[PDB]
Ligand binder design. Structure first.
Ligand SMILES: *[C@@H]1O[C@H](CO)[C@@H](O[C@@H]2O[C@H](CO)[C@@H](O)[C@H](O)[C@H]2NC(C)=O)[C@H](O)[C@H]1NC(C)=O
Ligand SMILES: *[C@@H]1O[C@H](CO)[C@@H](O[C@@H]2O[C@H](CO)[C@@H](O)[C@H](O)[C@H]2NC(C)=O)[C@H](O)[C@H]1NC(C)=O
Ligand SMILES: c1coc(CNc2ncnc3nc[nH]c23)c1
Ligand SMILES: c1coc(CNc2ncnc3nc[nH]c23)c1
Lengths: 540, 540
């Protein structure tokens, strides 16, 4: 026959091959390898996106690592001794514009830690799913929860109500709760507890939220900046033509003065040169590349676009460079020079903190994580089971129990490594479409994630305009659920619309879910009350 | 028989009755009156919403009417004579926070003018449609174009690139162009020139834009405020707990100083007390009222909710009052005391200005108006023709030619009166569902609009939290078009997603359309090039 056929027949009839039920599922070794490769190509964008988004959270370090800064910018702090010269002690404002150099350095170290954490969590989840559940599903930090954890639960550079360690503890406890409810078969009841329009429209709302993030400045390609009158207008002006905003006090004559302690923003307001940012146009080029790759059914569309934009940004002395001519840029380029590096997690590994359990925001974030994971994992797992033809008449696909337990265990392990919840990727369908049927597909994806390590220097040098279009197009892909909402029935359209729109506007998944569920409950109060009276016999 | 039957038979067989073809359409006089009443009840919210939105544009008056203000707030300017005391001459900043009292007074006068202008334009459009076209369609300033004209073309208090008079000239010329192309049957070609996904998703994008406006502060109920890190978060804190933002200059040590000439914003940032604004909760109550009225198929849902919120706000010494204890509030309450007033347009009538024709923003706004009107009017007119069963096998419903000419003439007249383009309302379907078939329905709506005059004092005292939920629910109603987009085909999903999302985020209908069309063209360049090569014979 051939070497490939000999390998396939040897593996299929071996003890390892029969452990994965290769022969019973009509695929032995090379179909599984090809399916795993296709799935990894489809999901590889996460290696960059998850790390960047979680690094934007600020990590585990606080003002404690902000180096004191001299009164005058031109003198390095060690030389901050002289007449009328003093060292300014850092405060909370050191974490934001202008970011303290020490905090930025710690954020870069956290980005390396989170790259390794994403790779390790995805690897472990894939291995657990392949061995325990024996399904061709790949696990990794979900895109829906990455942004919620980074920009809402924790906030940009720790500006949220919950600290990064407390958010990790919330994710850990959420994974434990999910594992518990799945183990006792009580998950389906929680799934039903969520209103149908809200459940369906949460995906579209999260897609809009991710797209909005991809159109911010510190997150994506720009194109959406601050506006005094409208709060959002056309950004994409060059970084030099952007200024920060500070709170002020108005009066009845026209005087305006700064407010002490005000939280100054990033360079989000454009003063001139709109639609002239070279980084924005490079991001648009990457968007076009990914869009054509998706249209042409090319596996790895997002990774190809990210690679193009990042490689164009790897040049040192351009306006779209990822390594500006500064100390931080010099350090980033020095780390990037080493193509391969075995980075060890030093900050985000085992950074759980249960101080904020009593806080209400902790439980808001915990419940949002729990329900996003429940709904997403249920829908994705059953859709992949349908794709692979494992769903029987009753709706059970054999390894569903262990699939959900594996997902929950992966969430807990990811929390222990310092990353947002890890879920089963819909990109796994690609591997299913290529013939993957057993757990060897997940093991292949895990091996590719192993290979993803030793490349943190390349993965840590991906700019915002590279993250960018991947986020916008992920938001595009998640909008297809709007067709499942009955927009003629207002009792279902209003909750769905609220769920979709509050998520980007309030910029929070939890607020979108709360508003949608509240509107659904309010709009059905009349129907529920009438039905209760009827069931009691008052009405006919 | 009965008095009603005698009236119906008398009118149906009279010359006036046969002029409207009553007998040939199976409805004589009371069916038309009932249909007109139902249509007016459905569309009455415009009387408030259009006037408020266009008043937010700032009107025809500039810094020229800003009264000079004394150095100290406690001394009225006439007494601004003394040691170290001077009168500050107004500048452009007088138009924004803190708004100069003179400019605010002129804006209130403009609001009265625009209430009368909306009523008059709707009346004239309805009369023209009823007489010339003989259809049961009601015309009024369209909701899609109100916000674009007020907040994008002209900007809040004239902060946009085009002045209010120049925008009126743009609307006038756009109406003339629409009339010209309709007269020569060339409108359908322009309609086809717009890509299908962009055409379908523009409605949903405008709905999202209107909903976002309804969640702003100076426009709706709040619930969306400024955030330094995310640019949007949860508002609805009390007005006392909101502060303005000003541009500043950052450095490498941490000093931040004000930027001279910076455009200070309104009180958009919440410092504390989130979700505690009584006005926001009153707006939420109005939202619930309108939502139940829509669910229960109650005609006039939005007008009922607006009336409830406005009446609750008409009390003088509450936290949700429309007449705060100030000079402006006192004047507003004094005008409101007179229930009936015959206001005469003094500023916005005949305020056309053709200075900005050469500007590119003038033509951007003109083309956006033209295409929004073309697509909206085509879709709405043909949908109403289908509702009334006037569409034959070929797709012609007799009076379509004169219907489009009437719409264009109404647009021109509305521009002459100082209001955004006037279109045929989808609410006309209500009158069609009640039996209205002839032009007498439009005349009845016009008579109800006559009655709408003599009530400017009541219509001019409608707060933002009353406009509010009407805008959010209008945005809800316009989302049903998303089901007409194929979200599995990326060549159609990406342009549709861009069109939907750029409109609220860039906060502009023109930018949304431009981005959607550009993405559609880019994504189809490969297909078009391949097809061109094939048609030339290079490929097979
Ligand atoms: C941080 O450095 C800036 C200089 O870049 C200091 O600016 C001071 O404030 C204004 C701006 O020039 C002037 O009135 C002062 O003369 C500036 N002084 C100096 C030495 O530049 C700013 O004061 C510094 N911040 C602190 C806390 O010392
Ligand atoms: C505008 O009015 C205020 C009163 O509300 C004047 O008071 C100033 O207030 C600021 C901030 O509280 C102080 O820093 C100034 O020293 C105050 N000056 C005076 C003279 O009271 C303010 O001066 C007025 N501005 C102008 C330009 O006249
Ligand atoms: C809603 C939509 O997506 C999520 C969590 N993230 C996620 N789930 C499933 N498959 C994914 N593939 C990438 N990101 C994914 C919640
Ligand atoms: C897209 C959706 O609505 C418009 C213009 N406004 C408008 N058109 C048709 N019927 C309406 N009814 C209220 N506002 C309407 C454009």
């Amino acid at each position: 026959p051939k070497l490939l056929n000999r390998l396939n027949t040897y593996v299929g009839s071996s003890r390892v091959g029969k452990r994965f039920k290769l022969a019973e599922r009509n695929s032995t070794f090379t179909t599984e390898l090809r399916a795993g490769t296709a799935t990894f190509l489809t999901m590889a964008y996460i290696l960059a996106v998850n790390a960047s988004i979680l690094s934007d959270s600020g990590g585990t370090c606080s003002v404690s690592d902000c180096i004191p800064l001299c009164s005058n910018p031109a003198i390095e702090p060690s030389q901050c001794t002289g007449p009328g010269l003093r060292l300014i002690q850092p405060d909370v404002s050191c974490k934001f514009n202008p970011v303290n150099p020490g905090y930025a350095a710690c954020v870069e170290e956290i980005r390396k830690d989170l790259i390794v954490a994403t790779v390790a969590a995805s690897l472990i989840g894939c291995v657990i799913m392949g061995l325990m559940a024996n399904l061709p599903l790949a696990l990794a930090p979900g895109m829906g929860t990455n942004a919620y954890f980074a920009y809402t639960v924790v906030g940009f550079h720790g500006s949220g109500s919950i600290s990064y360690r407390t958010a990790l503890a919330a994710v850990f406890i959420e994974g434990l709760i999910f594992l518990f409810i799945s183990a006792i078969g009580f998950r389906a009841k929680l799934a039903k507890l969520v209103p149908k329009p809200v459940r369906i429209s949460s995906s579209a709302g999260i897609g809009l939220f991710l797209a909005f993030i991809g159109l911010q400045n510190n997150q994506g390609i720009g194109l959406v900046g601050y506006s005094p009158s409208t709060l959002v207008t056309l950004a994409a002006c060059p970084a030099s033509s952007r200024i920060s905003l500070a709170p002020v006090i108005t009066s009845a004559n026209g005087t305006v003065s700064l407010l002490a302690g005000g939280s100054v923003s990033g360079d989000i307001m454009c003063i001139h040169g709109r639609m002239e940012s070279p980084t924005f146009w490079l991001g648009i080029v990457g968007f076009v590349i990914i869009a054509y790759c998706l249209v042409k059914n090319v596996k790895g569309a997002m990774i190809y676009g990210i690679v193009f934009v990042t490689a164009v940004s790897w040049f040192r002395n351009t306006e779209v460079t990822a390594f500006p001519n500064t100390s931080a840029g010099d350090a980033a380029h020095d780390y990037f020079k080493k193509i391969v590096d075995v980075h060890v997690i030093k900050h985000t590994a085992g950074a759980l903190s249960f101080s904020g359990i009593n806080k209400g925001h902790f439980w808001e974030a915990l419940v949002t994580f729990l329900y996003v994971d429940i709904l997403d994992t249920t829908g994705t797992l059953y859709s992949m089971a349908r794709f692979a033809g494992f769903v029987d008449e009753k709706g059970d696909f054999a390894g569903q129990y262990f699939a959900f337990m594996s997902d929950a265990s992966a969430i807990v392990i990811g929390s222990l490594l310092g990353t947002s919840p890890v879920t089963v990727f819909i990109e796994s369908s690609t591997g299913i479409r290529e013939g993957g049927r057993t757990g060897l597909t997940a093991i292949t994806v895990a091996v590719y994630f192993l290979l993803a390590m030793f490349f943190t220097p390349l993965l840590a040098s991906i700019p915002a305009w590279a993250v960018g279009p991947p986020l916008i197009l992920v938001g595009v892909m998640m909008m297809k659920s709007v067709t499942e909402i009955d927009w003629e029935d207002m009792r279902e359209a209003i909750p769905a619309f609220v769920t979709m729109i509050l998520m980007p506007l309030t910029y929070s998944v939890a607020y979108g879910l709360i508003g949608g569920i509240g509107s659904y409950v309010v709009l059905h109060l009349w129907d529920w009350g009438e039905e209760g009276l009827v069931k009691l016999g008052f009405l006919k």
